[PDB]
Design a protein around this motif. Structure first.
Motif, short mmCIF file in Angstrom:
data_model
loop_
_atom_site.label_atom_id
_atom_site.label_comp_id
_atom_site.label_asym_id
_atom_site.label_seq_id
_atom_site.Cartn_x
_atom_site.Cartn_y
_atom_site.Cartn_z
N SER A 1 -5.41 -1.97 -6.66
CA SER A 1 -6.42 -2.80 -7.36
C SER A 1 -7.46 -3.31 -6.36
CB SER A 1 -5.74 -3.89 -8.18
OG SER A 1 -5.03 -4.79 -7.36
N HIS B 41 6.52 3.40 6.97
CA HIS B 41 7.16 3.43 5.67
C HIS B 41 7.08 4.79 4.98
CE1 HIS B 41 3.70 3.07 2.87
NE2 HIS B 41 3.30 1.96 3.47
N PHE B 140 -8.16 -0.36 -3.26
CA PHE B 140 -7.19 0.64 -2.87
C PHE B 140 -6.29 0.96 -4.05
CE2 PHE B 140 -7.47 -1.40 1.50
CZ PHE B 140 -7.93 -0.29 2.17
N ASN B 142 -2.81 3.68 -5.34
CA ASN B 142 -1.69 4.48 -4.87
C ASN B 142 -2.20 5.69 -4.10
OD1 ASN B 142 0.15 2.74 -6.03
ND2 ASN B 142 0.56 4.05 -7.80
N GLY B 143 -1.62 5.94 -2.93
CA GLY B 143 -2.03 7.06 -2.09
C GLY B 143 -2.95 6.64 -0.92
N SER B 144 -3.39 5.38 -0.89
CA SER B 144 -4.37 4.93 0.09
C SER B 144 -3.75 4.50 1.41
CB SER B 144 -5.19 3.76 -0.49
OG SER B 144 -4.33 2.70 -0.85
N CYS B 145 -2.41 4.34 1.47
CA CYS B 145 -1.79 3.90 2.72
C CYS B 145 -2.16 4.84 3.85
CB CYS B 145 -0.27 3.80 2.60
SG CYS B 145 0.24 2.64 1.32
N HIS B 163 -4.09 0.54 6.63
CA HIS B 163 -3.62 -0.02 5.39
C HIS B 163 -2.13 0.28 5.14
CE1 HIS B 163 -3.67 -1.76 1.56
NE2 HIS B 163 -3.56 -0.60 0.91
N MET B 165 -0.07 -2.04 2.48
CA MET B 165 0.41 -2.47 1.17
C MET B 165 -0.58 -3.35 0.40
SD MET B 165 3.10 -5.26 2.70
CE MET B 165 4.04 -3.80 3.10
N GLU B 166 -0.28 -3.47 -0.90
CA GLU B 166 -0.94 -4.41 -1.80
C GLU B 166 0.00 -5.56 -2.16
OE1 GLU B 166 -2.44 -4.04 -6.28
OE2 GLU B 166 -3.89 -3.09 -4.89
N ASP B 187 6.92 -4.79 6.22
CA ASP B 187 6.87 -3.55 5.45
C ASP B 187 8.22 -3.34 4.76
OD1 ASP B 187 7.92 -2.99 8.02
OD2 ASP B 187 6.86 -1.11 8.28
N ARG B 188 8.48 -4.14 3.73
CA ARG B 188 9.61 -3.93 2.84
C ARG B 188 9.25 -4.44 1.45
NH1 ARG B 188 12.66 -8.02 5.27
NH2 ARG B 188 12.91 -6.01 6.36
O1 LIG Z 1 0.68 3.39 -2.40
C1 LIG Z 1 1.32 2.41 -2.20
C2 LIG Z 1 2.79 2.40 -1.96
N1 LIG Z 1 3.21 1.04 -1.76
C3 LIG Z 1 4.63 0.88 -1.55
C4 LIG Z 1 5.10 -0.21 -0.63
C5 LIG Z 1 5.63 -1.34 -1.21
C6 LIG Z 1 6.10 -2.35 -0.41
C7 LIG Z 1 6.05 -2.17 0.96
F1 LIG Z 1 6.50 -3.16 1.76
C8 LIG Z 1 5.54 -1.03 1.53
F2 LIG Z 1 5.52 -0.93 2.88
C9 LIG Z 1 5.05 -0.01 0.74
C10 LIG Z 1 2.05 0.10 -1.87
O2 LIG Z 1 1.97 -1.11 -1.77
N2 LIG Z 1 0.90 1.01 -2.12
C11 LIG Z 1 -0.45 0.56 -2.35
C12 LIG Z 1 -1.34 0.19 -1.38
N3 LIG Z 1 -2.54 -0.24 -1.74
C13 LIG Z 1 -2.92 -0.28 -2.99
C14 LIG Z 1 -2.06 0.07 -4.01
BR1 LIG Z 1 -2.54 0.00 -5.89
C15 LIG Z 1 -0.81 0.49 -3.67
#
Ligand SMILES: O=C1CN(Cc2ccc(F)c(F)c2)C(=O)N1c1cncc(Br)c1
Ligand SMILES: O=C1CN(Cc2ccc(F)c(F)c2)C(=O)N1c1cncc(Br)c1
Ligand code: NA
Lengths: 301, 304
Positions: A1, B41, B140, B142-145, B163, B165-166, B187-188
């Motif tokens: 988002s 991660h 961002f 999903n897929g942007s990490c 990047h 997480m969100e 990162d959990r």
């Molecule tokens: O693509 C992902 C995957 N993800 C999983 C995640 C959760 C908790 C964690 F501690 C962690 F290291 C990784 C996550 O947050 N994204 C995300 C990143 N930016 C904007 C969006 Br919408 C989604």
């Protein structure tokens, strides 16, 4: 988002920017295959500014009067011609970094990325929209002429704008890459002024749909409107008319959010009447009109 | 004329972005010299992510478990190791497009350009500030990490953000390129929240100077203030304290426009107490805090 004014990655365009010099005038040009495109006003002197006769100025030039520098390398100009308000300089090297590209002329309300350049070198990238009055609200200084505007849907660069001048109100005018001006402007220093600008209604509606997709509903209401009553009200706030085409274009966003286009129109009417009462939408306290329906779908989900 | 949220040209970073796959996870990596950097991660499943032991998960992996694609070309991974929260994949080819670069850690208030990427392919570029609460208000999916943030200081790219997480409020968290988080995050998958944020005072003042340079002058007034009285007001409105260093940094803009920092602070005091009375500044009805003093001077002076 999140939701941000986002530009296209500029790398494909950066590899096409060169510096063009004629006399004491330097500006930017766009090097694609073996042609460099730039504003024809590069051939004007101080005298020339009010009533230049470009055909007469150009006939007096040879190829070797045009210096083109691509990074640290001079290119050799082997031909020249004018098309409308752009000069095309044939050079003896095809640009090895030429992307897949096309030239597209856009309509008011369309957005694009601008790569601002000085002396053939990129300074920054930002997003703009073609205003209803055929100007753009850019960020440009002396030396920026020849800077271009583009989209990159897929791997293909669509060039849609080349920068030519700043008008007295601080907004900007230019051409498509076939050298036709957007709007009634001319490349002469006679008095010309942008007409009064209006808000791009279809874009504001798109952005309200963006806010809903990102989880905000506070500005919705239980009402609907006819298209004609919407337009009667909106025009009192200097909003462009919404057409049936625009209603059709918003169909996908409507289906995604479950809010009918004319119900979103009723929300907008109330916002215009009430203001935001200390609230924000997607981080703004004003209604945003520089995101298109296509922009919203691309950025969201 | 004009003033826009402007990112650095992204081309030098575009030539470093790759796709990293491990198991059913795909995300982005940064290919510099012969190393690919990405979030550690990438090695986790959902279950793992609840309570990961990274060292233990990694020791089970071979080089061939990491699939790295640069455009349409597979790179060969010949080594793998971890530094804080980033994974470093040694590959058999140096990136021929590696720019001059450094890894730098930035301070809250500082801005940078983000190149958002999906499946190793750059999709968009925008400007962000590191918030006082160490989040960024990005965009961002999903897929942007593994998307990165950077500045360009000459011909040298300074990488400052990757990047990860969100957060539940829809803002974003990540690390420097040495894998240290900005802010109190891990990162959990556990409950985490952004702390309450504040406004970046020195940046708002910079933007007011930008407005004046562009002809927008209605908020100027005859009054001046002291640092201590101004700071009492800032505190009341959840603005960061203004320091003497900040005053020094705004020195150029003060001399150029004829408006002393504490004269501009009196303008800002009044805006906080009274609002904008229907007016806008540089087209905004809110005070903007994501331009630094350096950003303003650079855009109002043409650096390339
Ligand atoms: O693509 C992902 C995957 N993800 C999983 C995640 C959760 C908790 C964690 F501690 C962690 F290291 C990784 C996550 O947050 N994204 C995300 C990143 N930016 C904007 C969006 Br919408 C989604
Ligand atoms: O660099 C220039 C030059 N110029 C004047 C001009 C003269 C004759 C013509 F025929 C014409 F089309 C334009 C102008 O407006 N800029 C500019 C462009 N953008 C932002 C700024 Br500040 C300045
Ligand atoms: Na004052």
């Amino acid at each position: 988002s999140g939701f941000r004014k986002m530009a296209f990655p500029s790398g494909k365009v950066e590899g096409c920017m060169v510096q063009v010099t004629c006399g004491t005038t330097t500006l930017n040009g766009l090097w694609l295959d073996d042609v460099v495109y730039c504003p024809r006003h590069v051939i004007c002197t101080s005298e020339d500014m009010l009533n230049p006769n470009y055909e007469d100025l150009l006939i007096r030039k040879s190829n070797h009067n045009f210096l083109v520098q691509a990074g640290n390398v001079q290119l050799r100009v082997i031909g020249h011609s004018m098309q409308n308000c752009v000069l095309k300089l044939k050079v003896d090297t095809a640009n090895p970094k030429t992307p897949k590209y096309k030239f597209v002329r856009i309509q008011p309300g369309q957005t694009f990325s601008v790569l601002a350049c000085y002396n053939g070198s990129p300074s920054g990238v930002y997003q703009c929209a073609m205003r209803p009055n055929f100007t753009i609200k850019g960020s440009f200084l002396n030396g920026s002429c020849g800077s271009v505007g583009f989209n990159i849907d897929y791997d293909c660069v669509s060039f849609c704008y080349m920068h030519h001048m700043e008008l007295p109100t601080g907004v900007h005018a230019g051409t498509d890459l076939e050298g036709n001006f957007y709007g009634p402007f001319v490349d002469r220093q006679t008095a010309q002024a942008a007409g009064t600008d209006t808000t791009i209604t279809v874009n504001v509606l798109a952005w309200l749909y963006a806010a809903v997709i990102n989880g905000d509903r506070w500005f919705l209401n239980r009402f609907t409107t006819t298209l004609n009553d919407f337009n009667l009200v909106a025009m009192k706030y200097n909003y462009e008319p919404l057409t049936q085409d625009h209603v059709d274009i918003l169909g996908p966003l409507s289906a995604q959010t479950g809010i009918a286009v004319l119900d979103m129109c009723a929300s907008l009417k109330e916002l215009l009447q009430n203001g935001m009462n200390g609230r924000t939408i997607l981080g703004s306290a004003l209604l945003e009109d520089e995101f298109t329906p296509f922009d919203v779908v691309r950025q969201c989900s």
